Design an enzyme around this catalytic site. Sequence first.
Site, PDB file in Angstrom:
ATOM      1  N   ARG A 281      54.050  36.289 -54.912  1.00 36.62           N
ATOM      2  CA  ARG A 281      53.033  35.449 -55.535  1.00 36.62           C
ATOM      3  C   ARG A 281      51.702  36.187 -55.632  1.00 36.62           C
ATOM      4  NH1 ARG A 281      54.626  30.165 -57.424  1.00 36.62           N
ATOM      5  NH2 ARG A 281      56.156  29.265 -55.971  1.00 36.62           N
TER       6      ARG A 281
ATOM      7  N   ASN B  15      47.958  24.203 -56.708  1.00 32.22           N
ATOM      8  CA  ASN B  15      47.310  25.508 -56.770  1.00 32.22           C
ATOM      9  C   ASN B  15      46.672  25.734 -58.139  1.00 32.22           C
ATOM     10  OD1 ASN B  15      50.009  25.774 -57.950  1.00 32.22           O
ATOM     11  ND2 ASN B  15      49.537  27.968 -58.076  1.00 32.22           N
ATOM     12  N   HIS B  16      47.113  24.960 -59.125  1.00 32.97           N
ATOM     13  CA  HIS B  16      46.585  25.072 -60.480  1.00 32.97           C
ATOM     14  C   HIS B  16      45.352  24.193 -60.659  1.00 32.97           C
ATOM     15  CE1 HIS B  16      49.556  27.453 -62.888  1.00 32.97           C
ATOM     16  NE2 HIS B  16      50.269  27.247 -61.795  1.00 32.97           N
TER      17      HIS B  16
ATOM     18  N   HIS C 162      56.246  23.717 -56.830  1.00 31.05           N
ATOM     19  CA  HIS C 162      55.635  25.027 -57.017  1.00 31.05           C
ATOM     20  C   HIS C 162      56.696  26.084 -57.317  1.00 31.05           C
ATOM     21  CE1 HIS C 162      52.540  27.912 -57.081  1.00 31.05           C
ATOM     22  NE2 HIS C 162      52.695  28.404 -55.863  1.00 31.05           N
TER      23      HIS C 162
ATOM     24  N   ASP D 207      56.147  20.065 -60.658  1.00 33.07           N
ATOM     25  CA  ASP D 207      55.117  20.560 -61.565  1.00 33.07           C
ATOM     26  C   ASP D 207      55.314  19.994 -62.969  1.00 33.07           C
ATOM     27  OD1 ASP D 207      55.158  22.112 -59.231  1.00 33.07           O
ATOM     28  OD2 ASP D 207      54.199  23.802 -60.256  1.00 33.07           O
TER      29      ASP D 207
ATOM     30  N   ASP E 188      47.650  23.636 -67.290  1.00 36.49           N
ATOM     31  CA  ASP E 188      48.094  25.018 -67.447  1.00 36.49           C
ATOM     32  C   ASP E 188      49.511  25.072 -68.008  1.00 36.49           C
ATOM     33  OD1 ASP E 188      45.693  26.062 -66.373  1.00 36.49           O
ATOM     34  OD2 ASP E 188      46.448  25.733 -64.335  1.00 36.49           O
ATOM     35  N   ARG E 189      49.849  26.192 -68.641  1.00 37.30           N
ATOM     36  CA  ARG E 189      51.172  26.369 -69.226  1.00 37.30           C
ATOM     37  C   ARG E 189      51.320  25.541 -70.498  1.00 37.30           C
ATOM     38  NH1 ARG E 189      52.624  29.998 -66.463  1.00 37.30           N
ATOM     39  NH2 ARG E 189      52.671  30.094 -64.171  1.00 37.30           N
TER      40      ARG E 189
ATOM     41  N   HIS F 289      52.427  20.827 -52.135  1.00 36.22           N
ATOM     42  CA  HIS F 289      52.655  21.645 -53.322  1.00 36.22           C
ATOM     43  C   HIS F 289      53.278  22.986 -52.947  1.00 36.22           C
ATOM     44  CE1 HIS F 289      52.011  22.698 -57.544  1.00 36.22           C
ATOM     45  NE2 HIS F 289      51.625  23.889 -57.125  1.00 36.22           N
TER      46      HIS F 289
ATOM     47  N   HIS G 214      52.763  20.927 -65.707  1.00 36.46           N
ATOM     48  CA  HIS G 214      52.250  21.957 -66.604  1.00 36.46           C
ATOM     49  C   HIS G 214      51.831  21.353 -67.942  1.00 36.46           C
ATOM     50  CE1 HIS G 214      52.605  25.500 -64.248  1.00 36.46           C
ATOM     51  NE2 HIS G 214      53.921  25.468 -64.143  1.00 36.46           N
TER      52      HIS G 214
ATOM     53  N   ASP H 231      49.768  20.366 -60.091  1.00 38.64           N
ATOM     54  CA  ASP H 231      50.110  21.216 -61.225  1.00 38.64           C
ATOM     55  C   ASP H 231      50.385  20.377 -62.469  1.00 38.64           C
ATOM     56  OD1 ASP H 231      49.853  23.448 -59.634  1.00 38.64           O
ATOM     57  OD2 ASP H 231      51.765  24.329 -60.268  1.00 38.64           O
TER      58      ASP H 231
END
Lengths: 16, 327
Positions: free
Chosen positions: B234, B130-131, B261, B70, B101-102, B179, B72, B98
């Site tokens: 999760r 998933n992001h 992930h 990831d 995000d973050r 992922h 991010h 991913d």
Amino acid sequence: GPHPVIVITGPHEELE
Amino acid sequence: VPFPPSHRLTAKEVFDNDGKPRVDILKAHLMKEGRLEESVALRIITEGASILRQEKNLLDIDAPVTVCGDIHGQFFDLMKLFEVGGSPANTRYLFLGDYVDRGYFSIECVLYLWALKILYPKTLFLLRGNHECRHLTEYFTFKQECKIKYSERVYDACMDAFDCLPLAALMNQQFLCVHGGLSPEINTLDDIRKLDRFKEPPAYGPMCDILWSDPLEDFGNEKTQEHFTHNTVRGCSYFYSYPAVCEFLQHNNLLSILRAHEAQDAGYRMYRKSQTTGFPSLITIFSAPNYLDVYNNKAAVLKYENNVMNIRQFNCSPHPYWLPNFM
């Protein structure tokens, strides 16, 4: 241990 | 402290007469906190989606590639990673998704990742995470970022482009790049091919699970021995055990499952190995150092070549401070 070949390098700054 | 350049790079500035992007010019600019023209950014995103759209849900290529965890939107951490892993100009890389995000620099990651994919689409592979969705981007600071830096036009473009990203990849027809992990509704490679990538990931299902799939809280010292279970941690998807994954692999004659992930203090983590081969049934890679800017975890990337699995570790990188929600 891993049957095939495998290696690993060092970190950029040991923490603990 | 350095100041971000107000001058936005133009198309003719990023792309040469040969229509080839200058990763060198972009890299340097991005390093100075420089932004591109709304027109250029849209071109890169749209150009990348077209290429990915041609790709299949589960890519199958037999060659030495380096798997990354990831990101991010951690562009500042993406620059250092390439330095330790090597230049992408002659090095094949593979992202597990991913990328947004973050981090408050998701746009820089997607733009740089998209441009690098168009320049070296035969050496740089990017998977969906998933992001990589709209519902998530709306909740996170991704949407707000695109609107603060650019506009909704760029955001929408990325969303439609992300839907063109691959779900998984078969490296050397032995390792499975994903992922999340395996799925209960997927016991064969065909089950994945019959999946729809050009669409948004639902709150549940096979495609969603794979992206939300995660190992059991005790992928080692288990007492029940349950194959699959509800992912209460999760808050969605399911959980696979050591015996569950080992069953799928044997059935699909797979060597190991490389994915992320899951944040790691060492940037990686090896799971129980097969009783037959001295290799790990599952492997987690994390290329996002200093997660949440709080944890002092390190990053790393998996490099498979000439039947050799080399793991490169690295520390976090320097970056400016940004308040929550851009407050």
